[PDB]
Design a protein around this ligand. Structure first.
Ligand SMILES: [Mg+2]
Ligand SMILES: [Mg+2]
Ligand SMILES: [Mg+2]
Ligand SMILES: [Mg+2]
Ligand SMILES: [Mg+2]
Ligand SMILES: [Mg+2]
Ligand SMILES: [Mg+2]
Ligand SMILES: [Mg+2]
Ligand SMILES: [Mg+2]
Ligand SMILES: [Mg+2]
Ligand SMILES: [Mg+2]
Ligand SMILES: [Mg+2]
Ligand SMILES: [Mg+2]
Ligand SMILES: [Mg+2]
Ligand SMILES: [Mg+2]
Ligand SMILES: [Mg+2]
Ligand SMILES: [Mg+2]
Ligand SMILES: [Mg+2]
Ligand SMILES: [Mg+2]
Ligand SMILES: [Mg+2]
Ligand SMILES: [Mg+2]
Ligand SMILES: [Mg+2]
Ligand SMILES: [Mg+2]
Ligand SMILES: [Mg+2]
Ligand SMILES: [Mg+2]
Ligand SMILES: [Mg+2]
Ligand SMILES: [Mg+2]
Ligand SMILES: [Mg+2]
Ligand SMILES: [Mg+2]
Ligand SMILES: [Mg+2]
Ligand SMILES: [Mg+2]
Ligand SMILES: [Mg+2]
Ligand SMILES: [Mg+2]
Ligand SMILES: [Mg+2]
Ligand SMILES: [Mg+2]
Ligand SMILES: [Mg+2]
Lengths: 386, 63, 136
RNA sequence: AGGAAACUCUGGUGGAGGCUCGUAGCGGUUCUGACGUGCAAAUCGAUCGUCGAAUUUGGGUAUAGGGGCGAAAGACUAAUC
RNA sequence: UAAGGUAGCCAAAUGCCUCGUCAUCUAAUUAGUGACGCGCAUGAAUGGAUUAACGAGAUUCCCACUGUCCCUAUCUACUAU
RNA sequence: AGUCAAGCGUUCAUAGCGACAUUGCUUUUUGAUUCUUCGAUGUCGGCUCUUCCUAUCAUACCGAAGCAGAAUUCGGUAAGCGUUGGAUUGUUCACCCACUAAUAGGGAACGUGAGCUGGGUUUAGACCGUCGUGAGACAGGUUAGUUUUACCCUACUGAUGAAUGUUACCGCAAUAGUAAUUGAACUUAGUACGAGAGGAACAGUUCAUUCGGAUAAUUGGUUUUUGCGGCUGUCUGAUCAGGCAUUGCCGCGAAGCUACCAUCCGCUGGAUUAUGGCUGAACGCCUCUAAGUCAGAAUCCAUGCUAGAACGCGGUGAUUUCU
């Protein structure tokens, strides 16, 4: 018989299977559409989620009742040390999709990137790209012809980059390596830009700018095996339920004589790769700068790091991206930012944002003070101070 | 933005921090944290809580 | 809310389900209001229709004058006592649940309101804003 | 103490009751909880009924199968009625 | 007809029609209570009517209280592993 | 659900209906039957949860009206999306209150008891009424009454994993899934329309409902941080410092987890259905149609998103000597 009262479906079927991700770095499944008019630029960037804080900004929404009034918003900080370009690769378009035909690496690879090709680095001869380096040091022979091959073929070019993991307070020592699509000029211009940028660094402001809506791609925080009640949001059964009540009562009718795929069941929660779109960049902050946390209204020279550092992360001595809201993934996780795949006007992606004040109080508790100078001025002298 | 003062402990309240409480006599109290809020709703006297600005003013500590 | 709304209301945390009893702030001779319905509330299985500040509800007078008891009438929630966030991020709450009795268009049955009212209800209903002494 | 008298009233004393709250004890209401190839062919935990008697109980003794016994449920009569 | 149900009581644990009609209780009540009685099929030791107190008896409402619920979350021990 | 059309509809069979008749469909009614099951298929309702159907209640786009506007009615493509909270009743059904865009109808062994519950029916106890001489009977009423087992196979949810010279990195994308939904306010505008009463719509703006995916800066919750402090009883001769009280209790309590109880986010291109058209014969005229063709729906397919064939694939680095 029919279900007595209608109710919406618990959970979303387009986020199936709810399994662990393949890798800890989420894959960029799609890049912005290219145009052969703009200069050669990247389409994505790599950073590490450092934590959240609050800002205060004056809202400019002509029609809201809080127009030209101050609001506080939750932002998240992505520590982005400047990435390093080591290698490019091109893709020809077959009737079976895109296919890589070549990979041209830079001559000198750093230890933090060539640790990625090792599981036991401490007991190794470190022989990696040593014959490719001997393929270098001639005029150009074993490199320039593959570059010309990418020019002759390969109607989509991707640049191999790697993070600078030693510039972050993480204890990993093994950088993350990824491909970023180029979205400017012809194939020759793309590969010439890459060849010029071999063994060289790219800063985050060369690709992103303020008030730009971006997409955050990351693997969410893991929670292990989880029951159906929290995994899918089903209703808890009543109190006098034998054999437990954090379950689904009916897992299917008699016919079809099978448990359906659409029945909510227990399993892994978290550690899924997610892509959250339409996140406005509020500040492209420079690490080569004091007063990162200062605004034109605050004007007290304090960096973006809170008191006592970021919880479980550390300091933000490098450049960073302050982006509005929540992004998937926890702290210390590699996070791939991406430009928007379409142009959104919406009267919200076009809003220019100027910050008034940034919170730098301690996140290790109910922090009262933004700076140690303010703390000492309020509290006076102590017993340790003489 | 304005930095308000805690109505119980005299601490500085930054935007988006702490809570506000409107009592039936139309009086507005502000608390930086649930500690001071719970002490207020326990009706403790701030002149007898040793870490409050009112206490230190009453005892001339750092005065 | 609905008909007599003067503009919109940003989402206030719902603190008054049906069956809740709030005080009667105005001088219409009623003591308490008993919430039986929420105007504009959605439909979800097993979910109670819950009211926030500024919302128009249907209520009955459980205690008060017999001219007002034993009938359904529109009311307006003016004090919530469940903590809610404003867009400037201050979390605030009164110390009691309180509403006034109004017509379906928003004109109050009474003439004066005791205690404070929320400005998120005052801006939504001008007749409440007229008889309100202090608006926070 | 009051009253003409009949007798009434107040304060104590006393310690009655198949009285009452509540232990040990006896029982077994509810969770229709635990267990339910159990610790257990009836248990465990909490919540409960009663707790000076028409009480609880040992031993001895009597009643034996169409019979016994039954404050009566077709209950019990050696996990058997 | 032997006598034709008296005193009482009632949609009662007893009333088919029936969720009987009226009133009250609620925003709304096949429930509850108070009334009415041509009562399928109430009724006097087949005991009738009433009844203070008592009740692990059945039922309705009110106050208080609460994760029973809106709407779930978190923690501990022993499992499960 | 049709066909016909006597009449109703002021006038007018067919805007909407529609008698006397007649043709069907369905298996969500109740019957009829007895084919399977009596060496047992756990049997009413509710809760919970998924999917399916369309005979569409709402929403999208349209056609018709005895459609001036507003409201409404009939019908088409349409099952994409949603279809509620309660009083009484064991109820299915029902009847009211109220919200809503709407509170449409059904199936899946009359879905679903090794998923729950046990209120009801349907053992044994007991009461009343009627019947019976009686034991007893009653789809008459009432009350009390044990709801067992998965560790096996498959299915499903997750998790590994041999063999593809080894090992590592970066990738492609066949296939499969897919998601966003609805309303209000301002403005349009007291404008169009209408004698008046009344009274719109497109675009735009701000919010909100339902759902979903994350996240924990803040707020709230949680406390074995047994972290700090306090309190009772007892013990260590007292003090200090502690033990026990099945985590002794109380207040605060970071971190972590977590909440529409907190915050953020939830894309745009094509092909079409209904329908309206263009050109244009058949039928020298006319005609959206026969050839051809245009625009077009919450539709479909892509973009996007989620997994990645463990017998689908590509590129790339290093490839062992005194086993
Ligand atoms: Mg069903
Ligand atoms: Mg249905
Ligand atoms: Mg049970
Ligand atoms: Mg913190
Ligand atoms: Mg329900
Ligand atoms: Mg006694
Ligand atoms: Mg007693
Ligand atoms: Mg005892
Ligand atoms: Mg027991
Ligand atoms: Mg049991
Ligand atoms: Mg068991
Ligand atoms: Mg018997
Ligand atoms: Mg025996
Ligand atoms: Mg009589
Ligand atoms: Mg009667
Ligand atoms: Mg009731
Ligand atoms: Mg009666
Ligand atoms: Mg009798
Ligand atoms: Mg009893
Ligand atoms: Mg048969
Ligand atoms: Mg059988
Ligand atoms: Mg058989
Ligand atoms: Mg068999
Ligand atoms: Mg079976
Ligand atoms: Mg159809
Ligand atoms: Mg059937
Ligand atoms: Mg079953
Ligand atoms: Mg029963
Ligand atoms: Mg029986
Ligand atoms: Mg007889
Ligand atoms: Mg029978
Ligand atoms: Mg596909
Ligand atoms: Mg969630
Ligand atoms: Mg807290
Ligand atoms: Mg906490
Ligand atoms: Mg033409």
């Amino acid at each position: 018989s029919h279900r007595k009262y209608e109710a919406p479906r618990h959970g979303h079927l387009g986020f199936l299977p709810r399994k662990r991700a393949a890798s800890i770095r989420a894959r960029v499944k799609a890049f912005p559409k290219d145009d052969r008019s703009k200069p050669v630029a990247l389409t994505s960037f790599l950073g590490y989620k450092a934590g959240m804080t609050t800002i205060v900004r004056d809202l400019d929404r002509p029609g809201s009742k809080f127009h030209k009034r101050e609001v506080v918003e939750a932002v998240t900080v992505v520590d982005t040390p400047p990435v390093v370009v080591v290698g490019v690769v091109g893709y020809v378009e077959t009737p079976r999709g895109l296919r890589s035909l070549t990979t041209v690496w830079a001559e000198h690879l750093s230890d933090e990137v060539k640790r990625r090709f090792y599981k036991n680095w401490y007991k190794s001869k470190k022989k990696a790209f040593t014959k490719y380096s001997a393929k270098y040091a001639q005029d150009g022979a074993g490199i320039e012809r593959e570059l010309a091959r990418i020019k002759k073929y390969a109607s989509v070019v991707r640049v191999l980059v790697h993070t600078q993991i030693r510039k972050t307070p993480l204890a990993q020592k093994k950088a993350h390596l990824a491909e970023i699509q180029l979205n400017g000029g012809s194939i020759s211009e793309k590969v010439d830009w890459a060849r010029e940028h071999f063994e060289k660094t790219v800063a985050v402001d060369s690709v992103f700018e303020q008030n730009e809506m971006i997409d955050a791609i990351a693997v969410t925080k893991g929670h292990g095996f989880e029951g159906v009640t929290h995994r899918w949001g089903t209703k808890k059964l009543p109190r006098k339920t034998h054999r437990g009540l954090r379950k689904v009562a009916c897992i299917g009718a008699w016919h079809p004589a099978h448990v359906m795929w659409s029945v909510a069941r227990a399993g892994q929660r978290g550690y899924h790769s997610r892509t959250s779109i339409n996140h406005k960049i509020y500040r492209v902050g420079k690490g080569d700068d004091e007063a990162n946390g200062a605004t034109s209204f605050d004007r007290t020279k304090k960096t973006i790091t809170p008191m006592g550092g970021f919880v479980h992360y550390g300091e933000i001595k490098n450049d960073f991206i302050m982006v509005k809201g929540c992004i998937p993934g926890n702290r210390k996780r590699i996070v791939t930012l991406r430009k928007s795949l379409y142009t959104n006007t919406s009267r919200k992606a076009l809003e220019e944002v100027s910050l008034k004040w940034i919170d730098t109080a301690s996140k290790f508790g109910k922090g009262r003070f933004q700076t140690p100078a303010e703390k000492h001025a309020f509290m006076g002298t102590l017993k340790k101070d003489l | 933005m304005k930095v308000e003062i805690d109505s119980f402990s005299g601490a500085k309240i930054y935007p988006g921090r702490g809570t506000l409480f409107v009592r039936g006599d139309s009086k507005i109290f502000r608390f930086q944290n649930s500690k001071s809020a719970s002490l207020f709703k326990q009706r403790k006297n701030p002149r007898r809580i040793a870490w409050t600005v009112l206490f230190r003013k009453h005892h001339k500590k750092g005065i | 809310s609905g008909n007599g709304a003067q503009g919109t209301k940003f989402r206030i945390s719902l603190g008054l389900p049906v069956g809740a009893i709030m005080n009667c702030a105005d001088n219409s001779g009623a003591r308490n209001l008993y919430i039986i319905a929420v105007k504009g509330s959605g439909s979800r299985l097993n979910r109670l229709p819950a009211a926030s500040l500024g919302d128009m509800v249907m209520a009955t007078v459980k205690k008060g004058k017999p001219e007002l008891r034993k009938k359904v009438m529109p009311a307006i929630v003016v004090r919530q006592a469940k903590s809610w966030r404003r867009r400037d991020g201050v979390f605030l709450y009164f110390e009691d649940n309180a509403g006034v009795i109004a017509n379906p268009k928003g004109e109050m049955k009474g003439s004066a309101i005791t205690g404070p009212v929320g400005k998120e209800c005052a801006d939504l209903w001008p007749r409440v804003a007229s008889n309100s002494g202090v608006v926070v």
